[PDB]
Amino acid sequence: MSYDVVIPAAGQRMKAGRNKLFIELKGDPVIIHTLRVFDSHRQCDKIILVINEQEREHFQQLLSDYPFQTSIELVAGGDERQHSVYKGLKAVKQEKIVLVHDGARPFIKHEQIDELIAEAEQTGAAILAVPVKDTIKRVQDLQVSETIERSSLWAVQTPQAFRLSLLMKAHAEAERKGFLGTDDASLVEQMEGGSVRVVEGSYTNIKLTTPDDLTSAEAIMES
Amino acid sequence: MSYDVVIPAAGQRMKAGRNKLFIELKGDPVIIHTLRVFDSHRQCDKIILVINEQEREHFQQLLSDYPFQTSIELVAGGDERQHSVYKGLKAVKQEKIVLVHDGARPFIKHEQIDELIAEAEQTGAAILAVPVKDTIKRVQDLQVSETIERSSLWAVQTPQAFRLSLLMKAHAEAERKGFLGTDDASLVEQMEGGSVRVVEGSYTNIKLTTPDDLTSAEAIMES
C-alpha cells in the first residue's frame, strides 16, 4: 500500500546554509528534485526530512519557496546518519512500510519504488542495487592486498524499504549494543535470522556530491 | 621513458563489423577517441590492437579513414581477453614498459598515464583505480549473503602498466597452469612475491558499453 519516506539531511558535514542538498541543479536545489519524485508518487503519504536544528530556518524558507501537496516534516537529527534515520523513523505514526532515501539521489523512478514496496511488504526488507561492473580490490597504503571475487557483488543504492516494526527493531537492537552500521539494510542483517532482498535498479540512480556528478546529472535530465 | 600499449578488441562478443568499439561518439567510433589519446602522447611508441581475424578488414578500413602518426598494428587475438592480451604482448619488440588498456575507455588523461609509467618503472606493476563510494554486498538469488567491508576498497580502471618482462612472466605462469585472471594485475598478484601498486585516477575515466554510457560520455566531452 502506502509509505513514509525518511531522508537524512544532517550531512552524514557543512556549516549552516551550506548543505550539499542546496546545490542547484538547473536552478533548483538537488533536494527539491528529489522531493518532487515522492510528492508526485501516489503511495507516498509523508516525507520526513531529518535535519540539523541550525538549518531549520533554511529548510523552512526553501520549502515555502517550493510548495508541495504531500506533507513534509522537519525532524531534528543527531550527529551520525544512523542516529538521524532512527529519530526520523520515530516520527512515523503507525505501522506501515517505510523507505529510507538519500536526498542526493534525485533520479529514482516510481517503478523502482513500487517494486521495492512490494518486496518489503512481502518479505520485510528490500534495497535497490545494481551489479558491480568493475574489478574491486582491497588496497593497503596504495598496495593491492587482494582482488575481491566479483561474480555476485552488487553496488547498493537507496531507497531501502522495510516494515517499520522491523527497521525500528533493527535500530533499537543496534543502538542497545553500540553497533554502527553503514546502511539501513546492514542493521537488519545484523539481527538473528535477519534477511534482506535485492531489487535491481538502474545505473542512472546516481548520488550527486561532487561537480562532475552535476555534469552527469544535467545530461540525465536533458535525456 | 616510453611504452607500447596493447588494446584487446576481440569482444572480451559480436558478429563481424558490429564490435562495440565501432559505436559512434559525436560521429567517430569510440576506439578512435581512445586511439587519439595515445597518438597525441609523446611517450607512446606503438599501439597494438588485438582483433578477431574476421574483423581485420573492418579495422583496416577504419584506420585508413583516420590516419595517425603513431604506428598501429593489428594482431590477431584468441577467444578470451587474457589470451588476446598475451598475443598482443608477444608483439612488443624489446624490453620496455607496456600498458594494457580498454578500447572503450576514451577519457584517460596523459597525466594519469605519466604517473602510471613512473610506478611501473619504479616497482614493476601499476593500475589506475578510484575509491569505491557505494556499499557493496554479495548476493545469492537476490538475497543478501553479506556486506563487504568498504574502508579500503577500490574500483579498478585501465590502463595497467608493467615492465614487459614481468607481465610476460605473469602471463606465461598463468597459462602453464591454466589460471584465468580477471585483469592483468591479478596475474601478477598470483605470482610468488608478486606486488601491484595503485595510482588514484578520476571518476571521468569511464568505460562505454551501454547507451546510457554514451549520454554520460557526451556530457564529459562537452564539459
Numbering used by the authors:
A (entry chain A), B (entry chain A): 1 to 12, 15 to 225
What sentences appear in the manuscript?
The third enzyme is 2-C-Methyl-d-erythritol-4-phosphate cytidyltransferase (IspD), 4-diphosphocytidyl-2-C-methyl-d-erythritol (CDPME) is formed from MEP by reaction with CTP12. The subunit structure of BsIspD was of a compact α/β fold from which a long β-meander extended. The core of the enzyme consisted of a seven β-sheets (β2, β1, β4, β9, β5, β8, β10) where all strands were parallel, apart from β8 and β2. The β-meander lay between antiparallel strands β6 and β7 and made the major contribution to the dimer interface, and the lesser contribution came from the side-chain interactions of the residues on the α-helix fragment at the C-terminus.
Two crystal structures of BsIspD have been determined in orthorhombic crystal form with space group P212121 and P21212, named apo form I and II, respectively. In the apo form II, only one molecule (molecule C) was retained in the asymmetric unit, the functional dimer was formed by the sysmetry operation. Two flexible loop regions (residues 13–14, 226–232) were not built in the final model, because of the poor quality of the electron density. In the structure of apo form II, although the residues 13 and 14 were not built, it was clear that the P-loop shifted upward from the active site, since the Cα atoms of Gly11, Gln12 and Arg15 shifted 4.5 Å, 5.8 Å and 2.1 Å, respectively, meanwhile, the side chain of Arg15 flipped to extend to Asp81 which moved about 3 Å. Therefore, the active site was more exposed to the solvent than that in the apo form I. Moreover, the L1-loop also rotated about 30° and moved about 3.0 Å. Here the residues of Gly11 and Gln12 were too far to interact with residues at the same time, only one hydrogen bond was formed bewteen Arg15 and Asp81 (Arg15 NH1-Asp81 OD1 = 3.3 Å). The structural difference of the P-loop in the two apo forms may imply that the P-loop was quite flexible. The chain-to-chain superposition for 223 Cα positions revealed the r.m.s.d between subunits C-A and C-B were 0.41 Å and 0.46 Å, respectively, while the comparison on the dimer gave an r.m.s.d of 0.59 Å for 446 pairs of Cα atoms.
